[PDB]
Design an enzyme around this catalytic site. Structure first.
Site, PDB file in Angstrom:
ATOM      1  CB  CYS A 140      -1.062  -0.040   1.287  1.00 40.68           C
ATOM      2  SG  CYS A 140      -2.163   1.352   1.366  1.00 40.68           S
ATOM      3  CG  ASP A 147      -2.203   3.871   4.041  1.00 42.58           C
ATOM      4  OD1 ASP A 147      -2.256   5.123   4.213  1.00 42.58           O
ATOM      5  OD2 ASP A 147      -3.304   3.169   3.819  1.00 42.58           O
ATOM      6  NE  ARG A 202       0.412   4.133   9.456  1.00 38.88           N
ATOM      7  CZ  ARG A 202       0.160   5.221   9.743  1.00 38.88           C
ATOM      8  NH1 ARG A 202       0.401   6.249   8.957  1.00 38.88           N
ATOM      9  NH2 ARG A 202       0.521   5.458  11.042  1.00 38.88           N
TER      10      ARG A 202
HETATM   11 ZN   LIG Z   1      -3.102   1.047   3.263  1.00 39.40          ZN
END
Ligand SMILES: [Zn+2]
Ligand SMILES: [Zn+2]
Ligand SMILES: [Zn+2]
Ligand SMILES: [Zn+2]
Lengths: 214, 214, 214, 214
Positions: D41, D43, D45
């Site tokens: 993704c 994102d 993270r």
């Molecule tokens: Zn994500």
């Protein structure tokens, strides 16, 4: 002209052919493979069947906004590959049209929303030929961009892996760039025809210098 | 019919039309905005204009292999956005056709190359309705898939940001799902016609559940 | 290093950090939205977090082959619209890298398969700047193309409806065009930084002319 | 942080590495092909490097919103085709993450604009697995969706023409589906590991079945 009118015309047109020309539906059932792939604009000012006198089943068609063959548009690229590798068409015709709302919006550049991303590709071409266009009279610029667009899309299609590897294995395929006007529906051939790597290039370059002469 | 015969037919058709009955090119010049967007298959077995008696310029047209509206296909979504936000069409018709080669390839799944990827969206549909399809005689599955596929692209169309946002702001746009066969060119309304979020869902659901009867 | 080893590296590393620095996960559990979007190459020669000293969650990332921003790629444009409209990032960095396999393959144009269509967008740039490139030695053309690519993708990004509507509703977003070498890891600002429509055009022309000087 | 602070962070780091962990640019000088392609993704993270301990140059990277592999996204399929055909990676890992903002938006369906189109591919999955999800505590549904998303993306990747024609010609490539959460950074294997189309399908079917028993 509501939708229920379209249903009712279709019903009258079909009910008349069933009984009056059984012909038709057998020609179609013959299911003969298409031989041309028309790549046109969604404006569809004059249908390609009407412009060329082609019958149903003889034309494979793709229409997007402003006849583009974007290097990475998998929709259009998919039409082409099915056509070439599977249907084994022999002619791919990219045909634009003078007065295209798409081409015009590419230059005026109004805030139309999401469509302007698609139209950025036509803008790329307007700036690419800044000088060629700045040298011809202000009133013939749009029409010429419409022609260049089509030249450029022919260029792109020829560089596609689909087409490069189709030519390389010997298969006969010919790209054409055309345009029609709405004042007379007459197809002007842009003379950028290509049957291999070499003509593709030659005809495209010849195409740009033929325009520099005005 | 080869390329020299299309350039000739067009000059005959054009000029022949202009000299005996010219008021046609007049009406086109008015460049009136189309009221229908037609999303159909590149096969174009019977052109939309012949199916419906819609004249030149009355319809925007998109065609890809098997009349798909993929969530993320900027090609079709640009056509749709332009047609809806800028031309303000009142009707969108997604029209499939029995015997489509795309739809068939999707199920038989031969090795065709690039096109197979595009077709996975149809294969997704085949497996989505595997039970419905399995409880039905083998010989009807292809025609059923053809309808199912139109029902799903309509459903897709109305879920796009473009349609969600046209409906919410009160614009009048109606989406239709049709299909025709070649034995009689007769249009069937698959009956998933939608004018807002709510009827979109209800129509889809009954579309599927009324097949599960039949 | 096979899969068995990545799972174990990860197990050890997670165990270790839960005993000895629970704050690492305390920081990450927060509603802290990323401030920067990074568009880089899938080569990922040196990761972005180690080039800049950026930490987990401080940046949104997109990577594709040769760090392109195609006018009509919904993948990258979705990442952008989300970053800008939703996460409200303040900086977008497009970062290429010298030696980029993508760039190199664009020019040498081997028959690599499907990826060549993606790379035609770089070839467009190779031919756009045919003169500037043509008047330097063969060895230096690859690194200039790399910076040319980055400049042209910033341009495209700036022209996208998303950036355009962002800038005109007075949202603060800065686009940057960087590149790093793999003899150092030193980031060269390519100096095309765009805050609005206006600086975008200025800085892009600045960029190309200033290259043509050297 | 600041943009000046990214440049000086980098500048600092580029000397404190050139001869203090001197065997960094020694390693990368050898432009060695990555063995792994990571699809995750945007994102990002916890980065893939930090999660697995993979070093720069060992993985190729694609990130998009919610780590998708759409049948007809050419951006992600281009990375894949180059990874597999050109770089000849042995392993492709699709990794999702719990608490992914993309997955959450797909469910809750706020109007975020353009990105909603992309997230509709996740909404399809949400609805595809309606029964599964309804037979679980509501609190568990977003985590399971995140996992089903990875499983469905893995399924898509294995059915692309790139993967089908790689496995037909005997190339060794393994697809994996993983997820991690931000609470411990611990990779969780979802056990859809496939080395050909037959185990792909089997692994997917049992992926869904074992969720159902749990
Ligand atoms: Zn994500
Ligand atoms: Zn047009
Ligand atoms: Zn068809
Ligand atoms: Zn690269």
């Amino acid at each position: 002209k509501d939708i229920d009118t379209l249903i009712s015309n279709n019903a009258l047109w079909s009910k008349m052919l069933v009984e009056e020309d059984p012909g038709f539906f057998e020609k179609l059932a013959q299911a003969q493979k298409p031989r041309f792939l028309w790549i046109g604009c969604s404006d569809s000012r004059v249908p390609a069947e009407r412009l060329t006198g082609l019958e149903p089943g003889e034309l494979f068609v793709h229409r997007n906004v402003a006849n583009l063959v974007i290097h990475t548009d998998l929709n259009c690229l998919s039409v082409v590959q099915y056509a070439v590798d599977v249907l084994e068409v022999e002619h791919i015709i990219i045909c634009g049209h003078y007065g295209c709302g798409g081409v015009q919006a590419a230059v005026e550049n109004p805030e139309l929303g999401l469509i302007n991303n698609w139209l950025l590709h036509i803008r790329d071409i307007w700036f690419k030929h800044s000088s060629l266009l700045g040298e011809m009279p202000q009133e013939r610029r749009l029409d010429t961009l419409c022609e260049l667009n089509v030249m450029e899309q022919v260029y792109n299609l020829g560089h596609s892996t689909i087409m490069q590897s189709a030519w390389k294995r010997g298969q006969k395929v010919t790209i054409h760039g055309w345009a029609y006007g709405i004042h007379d529906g007459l197809l002007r051939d842009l003379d950028v025809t290509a049957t291999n790597r070499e003509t593709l290039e030659q005809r495209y370059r010849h195409g740009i210098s033929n325009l520099k002469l005005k």
